[PDB]
Design a protein around this ligand. Structure first.
Ligand SMILES: Nc1nc2c(ncn2[C@@H]2O[C@H](COP(=O)(O)OP(=O)(O)OP(=O)(O)O)[C@@H](O)[C@H]2O)c(=O)[nH]1
Ligand SMILES: [Mg+2]
Lengths: 157, 154, 59, 55, 211, 55, 102, 259, 133, 484, 90
RNA sequence: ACCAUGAUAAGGAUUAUAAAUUGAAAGUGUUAAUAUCAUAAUCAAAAUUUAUUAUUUAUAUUAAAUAUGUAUGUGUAGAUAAAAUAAGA
């Protein structure tokens, strides 16, 4: 669910800066990207593409796809490294179908882990023996994991 | 504020006749309360504007009964008495919004639109980067760049 | 006032130019009483339409 | 605080009390019932009619 | 517009069906409490003494002159016994309203004209308002000069004691008296009456009045 | 009131903000001098449009 | 989650200190003048977030709706199986006419 | 009730109380069903079947004197009269008393709208009212506080059938002290108009209108006529006046055709 | 220079009349929250009193009138089909009715109000001056 | 009709919250007035009192175990004393200058309040504090968005600065990481600075702990600092911070880089005084700041643009992003965290979830209607156990006990201060309807409780007061008919 | 939950839209916390249904579900008009 | 090709004695004005395509000017979610 604007406003008579009324090509709409298709004054191939409804809708569909791409790439705190089949963990020793090939696969339902394998992200400090066997100096420190059974401040002791 | 174009003014009776569309839109009316709640003042003309328009939208689909005839003009004049009372309250909140948001804009160093008066900074209509190169109503040429209403450092 | 002067005579001009057609015992006494009452009331309205047809109007 | 508010309820149109119900325009648009809507609502019968049939 | 496609249950939108069963049990309870009750304009406040009654008002009941007299005979009744009791230092302000004019005169207790009659030509509702306002602006130093000639200072704290009398039944009657009502710190009006002519016979009236 | 009179400094399409009465004309009188003063025809350019016999 | 501390206190107040157990809204005899036969699913349905209500991550829903339409005709009809599903040959005769009753 | 491009009140009034409606009730074969057919106790008692007035017997008399002379006395009691007696509908219920409250109306008519004889008559009423307002009956004058009374103007109709004296008070809270007693003076004002005022077009009905300074005057006549000449569209009024001249010429030609 | 009726004279109030359409954002509310955060922690209370003086002046309850006139003092049934003449009337009629010319808002200092505190000493910014004595 | 307003007298004001009472004509029907009869030189003594009073203004030493899930307040003079930096991201949205400065005392708030009570004498309670943090340097507080994260962090500085402990308080970490502009460090090679965030940090930290930093003798600080005519060389840590931020531009840009580095060097050597370091939004300090590295063509130098083999003015490009570890402020923090020779600094910090929403697709945000206009553009997942060395504390939304106490403070004390319905109390519902409804709209989320409290104005489908006024008008007309 | 997302995130935390979903529960004199509800959108798919016309159909879907669960719920729900369908298009 | 088409405007009537239903809405008659080119002997208007100093309405370009005085339309359009200065003589 997203509350941003996706469609372009239609064509009518020339709007004015009023209450609940913005001009059709303004710097506020779509982050100022309408300056490519705006007219300041209140050459035939360079005038008619600004007034075609299918043409101005396709450009917003490109700009909204650019906004969809940059937020999907800013979510990536990981990267894809081709790891061979022998040094991979036990949940990746299975036959993994490609994207949109099968049902979205659970990781391992036998161990009560119902999650998609395609969104599984492994920490880099776990695979130091696989990714860096040539260094031999432990370039990344081990992850300090907190003791869940230790009496701490959250357990009133 | 990124709306710096020249604008067209509307009479206040055309604003309130929109009703739930723009004047009493609930997303707009709740952020007008947060302006008054930040400054520590009563939202008293705003709440009584909202209580009236809450009940006005409740019966707005009902058709009025046919006025079959009265010898004296009593309930017709009384229904118009309450109707002209509801407009004067919403005339006050229409003035209360425009007074306070121009007082807030003088504090936050935010420049208004064209030909807009802020009482603390620019008593005349502040015009910045207009299509017409001179003042629209004061008949004076605009300098380049735009007029600095505030000091420099943030 | 010019539009008031226009709204009077232009219905007479458009009448002539555009749409003018081609030319060429007491109970019965009460019925005559009501018809004479109807024509005495609208005598000034009917006198103009006969005068436009008979072309007698001082402009 | 609800026992005190019911005695100071502005039942009449005053300064901050606005009708706005269309009571001046339409008049009495909201219904009100004094009977229990059977079988959704229940009020027990009075003892005068109970003692009348019992006697 | 035409809301004929809208159902009849959606047009008033009668909500709050949860509370109705709450109210009837609220009613049949309270009647029983009435059975538990059934089986089981205003005068002004009191004055106690005259010493602080002198401080509550601007006068005193007990006279301090100590008039010692022995008139055993029956006292002489006044001609107009049921009237306002006009003391000696009271100025009678006469406001005469007309259609196009409003006049304001001030007389003493004995009939001496204090100030000349102000006219709109000389100096409606606001017409009479401004005429009697500019009359009361000039009436204060003339009153102070006419009372200071005998020994009455009237400087601080003393309000000018006024009796207002109006003529006309016109619009200028409205704005005149209001322009005395804002002068409450200066002019204290005690008797606000009117002086309106009773048409006893009348000499004659012009032709446009009759026919 | 405001806008009831027309001062000669202000233009006719705009509205004056002054409330004074002296030195101002009414809008019935302003409509008279606009109907009175507007008698002239703009000069026809002779050299811009050739004559029909030449064409 | 487990039930809240206000919930299990207010129930145990009425269960123990008031001697009247709090019953489910499906156990309330709302019809006055009628006794309902109290169906068996009144309080026996366990509240688990895995079964109801349905809330998911959106990217699993984005993967589901694209994989369901692209795998439409990825079906093996003639399977070595039981009855009406399983067969050896499958004949489909698509009849086309201008009227639905034709 | 189906209106048919009319107000429903006037349509039901024409279908109930007109002369072709009651003649269709008696039976005349009028054009198409001018009366209401099915009515029970809501039928008026004038047009009942057992009543003593029948318009078919009254159509043969040419004069009201002949109807008063020759017709039988009406039948007093009927079944519909019994139902209206049981319902209490023999006399209408008394409305709210309009004698002493006010005359609240939206606007006030200008002096340019009324006749010049109406302006002269209203000026005479204003003169004789402001002259002799102390010369009222003394049992009403003992309660009227004349210090607050203001008579600002007198308005009238075009033939002076009713007069509206517009009044207010200095203090508005005294208005309810001067409201009922001023409505006890309507016959005194009428006798003052009969006595003092000559050339009176009608002996008028007196109505008091409270103003307070607030009630607004209407526009004058010439400004309203110029507004209707400046604002209203020329095409619709143009074709309506042309069609009116067509109807007038057609009536002239039909009057010329009949010898 | 194309003169129009949109001049919006800056005389009869702090806001110009026939005012321009203004729009509030949540970015304006976040800057106003940060401005009042800094103004309270700096001790600056003179800007708050100017807001409260504008609030006390213009947010009074309008008087509940008696019967007799309506808000269209001029009858708006004359403009039936001339739509552009009706909106040009409504711009000019609301231009003459300035906020100084409301006359139903008790704006002036002659009025008394038990709702809002009038002097800035009554506000809790100076509470140690009138604590108990 | 039953007013009881003229008979009401004002109680004596003892604190700032008692002076926040509005005139009685405002809250007469909002907060109703009851009357009690005392036996004082006569059997009736009519004493008209309020049903609701303000929650008590208490110092943190007076807060106890019985005040858990209750409401308390702080003074306005205590607010300007203990918070010169400000408050969290959304904490001050409920405190205008007319409103009292209230705070909810939760059960996790009580655990941290007794923790700082042991931090105040840490050398005798060292084995206690090591077992509480499980040997870590401090606590990180993580949860969903809009819960009591920054609202708890401003309470910790209220707990510690009232116990006269020196506190490093970062009120919001988006001034450092997501700042206006980034400048490289003058004395630290390869490191960067947030200069506008540093001058505000060096200003308010000096005013906050002026009682302790004036007694702070400079141990490892060079005495040949650059100093203009008329200024004194710093001999205290308070004088060092006033040397840094109090200067003229542009000389304040390089002065803070010297001051912040020497502040972090002075704090890391002190092993005797407890220094609590509270950071709002440690997850911004645990990953990359939004600044990027400059292109190397800007520092290389060019003769012309047409023949230089560059496109810096032609096409933009994304350089690798600068991490927070390369900032001079976070370098001194990470020096004290990782090096085990400091059993003296307690990092009670938290995270922020103020990022924008993104749920698969995204259009453009409307400029007028955007609640996330000043939100962070990160979209990154965060795990406090894997991305921080602190002990994670998981706080959820409110339960119905503290949600009732928080909503009672919002509704009643808002109308008592003259900021709520007031005379329009008859249009809004009672408290039990509002508690039932806002708990549905918010899900007892603390930001949603504050947001739907303002959205209570635009409720359309509440029919409680309509049916109540119908019943009371019906009951009135039959009561006078009984009297007739 | 509406289409896998909670109601505070579907209708963008708007109180005047989400209170129509509560309206089948309060008119029935019922607590909303004793019921779990999932609403599936079968009409035109949109990225945001934050409007009063979509919340009208969200009210009717819950109100028809309350009648099928408990049959005596239909007596206050029909009187409040929550089960009434209007026919208005664009 | 001189047929007697067809469009415009105007007035009439019938039903709701229910609080249920998602939804109390649907069927039937008369007068004025305008108008009427098909049983016969042909052919390329814009059947129809293309181009030049030239005729328009639109398309965008497109500026000075405070010495005084000053400049109001009919229409064209998009989806459609306000309403009582005129006499049922
Ligand atoms: N007075 C008071 N308000 C609280 C308390 N807990 C939560 N709130 C309210 O809840 C809202 C959330 O406050 P924050 O702590 O800033 O929310 P957050 O978890 O930091 O949100 P993010 O920064 O986006 O992660 C605030 O606006 C407060 O009004 C509390 O204990 N006392
Ligand atoms: Mg936070």
């Amino acid at each position: 669910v997203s509350t941003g604007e996706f469609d372009h406003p239609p064509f009518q008579f020339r709007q004015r800066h009023t209450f609940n009324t913005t001009p059709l090509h303004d710097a506020n709409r779509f982050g100022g990207r309408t300056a490519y298709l705006r007219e300041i004054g209140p050459k035939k191939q360079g005038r008619r593409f600004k007034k075609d409804p299918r043409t101005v809708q396709f450009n917003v569909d490109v700009w909204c796809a650019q906004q969809t791409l940059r937020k999907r790439w800013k979510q990536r705190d990981w990267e894809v490294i081709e790891i061979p089949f022998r040094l991979v963990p036990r949940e990746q020793q299975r036959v993994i179908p490609e994207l949109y090939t099968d049902i979205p696969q659970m990781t391992d339902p036998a161990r009560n882990d119902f999650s998609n394998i395609r969104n599984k992200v492994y920490d880099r400090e776990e695979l130091q023996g696989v990714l860096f066997p040539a260094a031999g100096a432990m370039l990344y420190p081990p992850l300090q994991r907190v003791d869940k059974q230790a009496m701490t401040l959250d357990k009133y002791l | 504020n990124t709306f710096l174009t020249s604008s067209v003014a509307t009479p206040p009776i055309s604003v309130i006749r929109t009703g739930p569309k723009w004047w009493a839109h609930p997303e707009r009316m709740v952020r007008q309360k947060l302006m008054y709640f930040t400054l520590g003042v009563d939202q008293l003309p705003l709440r009584r504007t909202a209580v009236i328009q809450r009940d006005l939208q409740r019966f707005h689909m009902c058709k009025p009964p046919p006025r079959v005839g009265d010898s004296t003009g009593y309930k017709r004049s009384r229904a118009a008495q309450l109707n002209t009372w509801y407009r004067r309250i919403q005339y006050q909140e229409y003035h209360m919004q425009h007074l306070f948001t121009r007082h807030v804009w003088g504090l936050l160093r935010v420049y208004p639109g064209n030909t807009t008066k802020i009482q603390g900074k620019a008593d005349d209509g502040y015009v910045g980067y207009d299509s017409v190169p001179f003042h629209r109503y004061n008949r004076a040429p605009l300098p380049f760049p735009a007029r600095e209403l505030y000091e420099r450092r943030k | 006032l010019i539009r008031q002067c226009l709204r009077d005579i232009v219905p007479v001009i458009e009448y002539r130019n555009r749409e003018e057609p081609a030319r060429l015992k007491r109970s019965q006494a009460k019925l005559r009483f009501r018809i004479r009452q109807r024509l005495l009331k609208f005598q000034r309205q009917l006198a103009v339409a006969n005068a436009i047809a008979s072309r007698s109007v001082l402009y | 605080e609800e026992r005190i508010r019911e005695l100071m309820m502005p039942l009449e149109v005053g300064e901050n009390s606005f009708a706005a119900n269309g009571q001046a325009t339409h008049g009495n648009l909201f219904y009100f019932r004094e009977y229990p809507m059977y079988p959704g609502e229940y009020v027990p019968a009075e003892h005068n009619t109970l003692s009348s049939l019992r006697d | 517009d035409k809301y004929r496609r809208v159902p009849m249950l959606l047009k008033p939108q009668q909500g709050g069906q949860q509370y109705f069963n709450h109210f009837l049990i609220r009613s049949t309870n309270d009647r029983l409490t009435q059975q538990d009750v059934d089986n089981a304009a205003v005068p002004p406040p009191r004055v106690l003494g005259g010493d602080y009654f002198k401080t509550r008002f601007g006068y005193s009941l007990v006279k301090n002159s100590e008039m010692t007299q022995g008139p055993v005979d029956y006292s002489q009744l006044d001609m107009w016994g049921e009237m306002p009791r006009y003391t000696s230092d009271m100025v009678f302000l006469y406001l005469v309203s007309r259609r196009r004019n409003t006049y304001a005169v001030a007389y003493t207790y004995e009939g001496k004209r204090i100030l000349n009659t102000y006219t709109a030509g000389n100096r409606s509702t606001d017409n009479g308002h401004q005429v009697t306002s500019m009359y009361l602006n000039d009436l204060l130093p003339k009153l102070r000069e006419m009372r200071a000639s005998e020994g009455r200072p009237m400087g601080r704290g003393e309000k000018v004691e006024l009796v207002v009398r109006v003529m006309g039944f016109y619009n200028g009657r409205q704005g005149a008296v209001r322009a005395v009502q804002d002068r409450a710190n200066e002019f204290h009006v005690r008797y606000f009456e009117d002086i309106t002519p009773f048409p006893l016979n009348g000499p004659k009236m012009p032709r446009g009045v009759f026919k | 009131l405001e806008g009831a009179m027309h001062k000669p400094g202000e233009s006719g399409l705009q509205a004056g903000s002054s409330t004074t009465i002296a030195g101002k004309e009414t809008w019935s009188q302003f409509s008279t001098k606009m109907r009175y003063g507007r008698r002239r025809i703009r000069v026809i350019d002779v050299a811009a449009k050739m004559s029909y016999e030449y064409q | 989650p487990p039930p809240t501390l206000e919930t299990i206190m207010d129930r145990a107040v009425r269960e123990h200190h008031q001697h009247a157990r709090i019953l489910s809204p499906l156990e309330v005899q709302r019809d006055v003048g009628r006794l309902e036969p109290i169906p068996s699913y009144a309080g026996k349905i366990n509240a688990d977030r895995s079964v109801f209500p349905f809330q998911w991550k959106t990217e699993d829903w984005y993967e589901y709706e694209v994989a369901k339409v692209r795998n439409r005709r990825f079906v093996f009809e003639n399977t070595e199986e039981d009855g009406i599903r399983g067969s050896e040959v499958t004949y489909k005769i698509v009849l086309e006419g201008f009227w639905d009753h034709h | 009730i189906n209106s048919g491009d009319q107000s429903p009140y006037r349509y039901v009034e024409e279908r109930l109380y007109s002369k072709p409606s009651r003649l269709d009730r008696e039976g005349v074969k009028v054009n198409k069903t001018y009366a209401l057919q099915g009515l029970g106790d809501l039928e008026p008692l004038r047009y009942g079947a057992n009543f003593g007035i029948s318009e078919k017997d009254a159509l043969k008399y040419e004069t009201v004197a002949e109807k008063a002379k020759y017709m039988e006395p009406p039948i007093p009691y009927s079944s519909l009269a019994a139902r209206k007696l049981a319902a209490g509908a023999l006399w209408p219920a008394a409305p709210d008393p309009e004698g002493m409250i006010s005359k609240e109306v939206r606007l006030l008519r200008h002096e340019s709208s009324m006749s010049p004889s109406a302006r002269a008559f209203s000026e005479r009423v204003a003169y004789h009212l402001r002259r002799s307002l102390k010369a009222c009956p003394g049992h009403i004058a003992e309660h009227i506080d004349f210090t607050q009374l203001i008579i600002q103007e007198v308005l009238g109709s075009r033939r002076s059938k009713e007069i509206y004296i517009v009044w207010f008070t200095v203090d508005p809270g005294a208005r309810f002290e001067l409201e009922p007693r001023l409505h006890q003076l309507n016959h005194w004002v009428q006798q003052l108009i009969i006595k003092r005022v000559k050339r009176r077009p009608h002996i008028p009905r007196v109505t008091w209108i409270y103003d307070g300074g607030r009630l607004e005057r209407e526009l004058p006549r010439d400004v309203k006529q110029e507004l209707q000449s400046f604002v209203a569209d020329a095409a619709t009024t143009l074709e309506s006046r042309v069609k009116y001249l067509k109807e007038l010429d057609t009536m002239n030609q039909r009057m010329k055709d009949i010898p | 220079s194309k003169p129009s009726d949109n001049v919006a004279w800056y005389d009869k109030g702090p806001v110009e009349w026939l005012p321009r359409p203004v729009r509030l954002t949540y970015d304006h509310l976040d800057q106003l929250q940060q401005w009042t955060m800094r103004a309270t922690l700096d001790g600056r209370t003179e800007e708050f009193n100017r807001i409260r003086d504008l609030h006390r002046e213009w947010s009074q309850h309008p008087l509940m009138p008696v019967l007799g006139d309506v808000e269209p003092k001029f009858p708006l049934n004359l403009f039936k089909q001339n739509h552009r003449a009706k909106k040009r009337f409504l711009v000019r009629w609301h231009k003459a009715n300035t906020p100084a010319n409301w006359l139903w808002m008790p704006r002036g200092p002659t009025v008394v109000t038990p709702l809002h505190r009038t002097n800035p000493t009554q506000y809790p910014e100076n509470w140690k001056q009138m604590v108990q004595r | 009709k039953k007013s009881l307003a003229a008979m009401y007298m004002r109680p004596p004001v003892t604190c700032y919250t008692d002076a926040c009472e509005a005139p009685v004509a405002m809250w007469d029907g909002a907060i109703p007035l009851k009357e009690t009869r005392k036996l004082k030189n006569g059997v009736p003594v009519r004493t008209v009192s309020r049903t609701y009073s303000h929650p008590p203004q208490l110092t943190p030493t007076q807060l106890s175990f019985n005040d858990i899930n209750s409401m308390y307040c702080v003074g306005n003079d205590e607010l300007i004393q203990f918070f010169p930096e400000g408050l969290g991201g959304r904490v001050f949205q409920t405190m205008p200058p007319g409103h009292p400065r209230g705070f909810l005392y939760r059960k996790e708030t009580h655990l941290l309040n007794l923790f700082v009570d042991k931090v105040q004498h840490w050398h005798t309670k060292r084995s206690v504090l090591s077992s509480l943090t499980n040997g870590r340097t401090g606590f990180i507080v993580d949860g969903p968005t809009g819960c009591g994260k920054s609202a708890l962090m401003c309470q910790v500085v209220h707990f510690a600065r009232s116990r006269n402990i020196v506190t490093l308080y970062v009120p919001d970490a988006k001034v450092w990481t997501h700042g206006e502009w980034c400048w490289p460090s003058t004395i630290l090679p390869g490191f960067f600075d947030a200069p506008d965030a540093a001058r505000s940090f060096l200003k308010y930290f000096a005013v906050a702990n002026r009682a302790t930093l004036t007694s702070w003798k400079l141990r490892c600080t060079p005495k040949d600092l650059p100093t203009e005519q008329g200024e004194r060389q710093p001999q205290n840590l308070y004088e060092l911070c006033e040397w840094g931020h109090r200067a003229v531009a542009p000389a304040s840009i390089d002065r803070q880089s010297v001051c912040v580095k020497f502040l972090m060097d002075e704090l890391s050597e002190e092993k005797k005084l407890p220094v609590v370091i509270v950071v709002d939004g440690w997850n911004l300090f645990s990953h990359e700041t939004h600044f990027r590295y400059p292109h190397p063509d800007f520092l290389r130098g060019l003769a012309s643009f047409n023949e230089s083999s560059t496109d810096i003015d032609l096409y933009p490009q994304e350089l690798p992003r600068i991490p927070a570890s390369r900032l001079s402020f976070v370098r001194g923090l990470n020096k004290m965290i990782l090096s085990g020779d400091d059993p003296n600094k307690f990092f009670i910090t938290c995270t922020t979830r103020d990022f924008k929403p993104f749920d698969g697709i995204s259009g453009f945000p409307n400029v007028e209607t955007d609640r996330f206009a000043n939100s962070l553009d990160e979209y990154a997942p965060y795990d406090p156990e894997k991305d921080s060395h602190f002990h994670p504390i998981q706080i959820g939304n409110f339960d119905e006990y503290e949600y009732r106490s928080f909503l009672r403070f919002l509704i009643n004390s808002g109308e008592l201060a003259g900021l709520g319905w007031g005379p329009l109390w008859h249009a809004s519902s009672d408290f039990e309807r509002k508690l039932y409804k806002i708990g549905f709209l918010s899900g007892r989320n603390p930001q949603g409780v504050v947001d739907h409290y303002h959205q209570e104005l635009v409720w359309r489908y509440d029919y409680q007061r309509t049916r109540q006024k119908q019943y009371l008008l019906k009951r009135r007309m039959e009561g006078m008919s009984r009297g007739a | 939950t509406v289409m896998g997302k909670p109601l505070s995130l579907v209708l963008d935390n708007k109180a005047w839209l989400m209170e129509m979903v509560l309206m089948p529960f309060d008119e029935a004199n019922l607590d909303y916390r004793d019921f779990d509800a999932h609403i599936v959108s079968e009409g035109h798919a949109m990225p945001s249904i934050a409007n009063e016309i979509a919340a009208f159909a969200l009210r009717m879907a819950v109100a028809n579900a309350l009648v099928k669960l408990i049959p005596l719920t239909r007596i206050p729900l029909k009187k409040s008009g929550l089960l009434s369908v209007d026919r208005r298009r664009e």
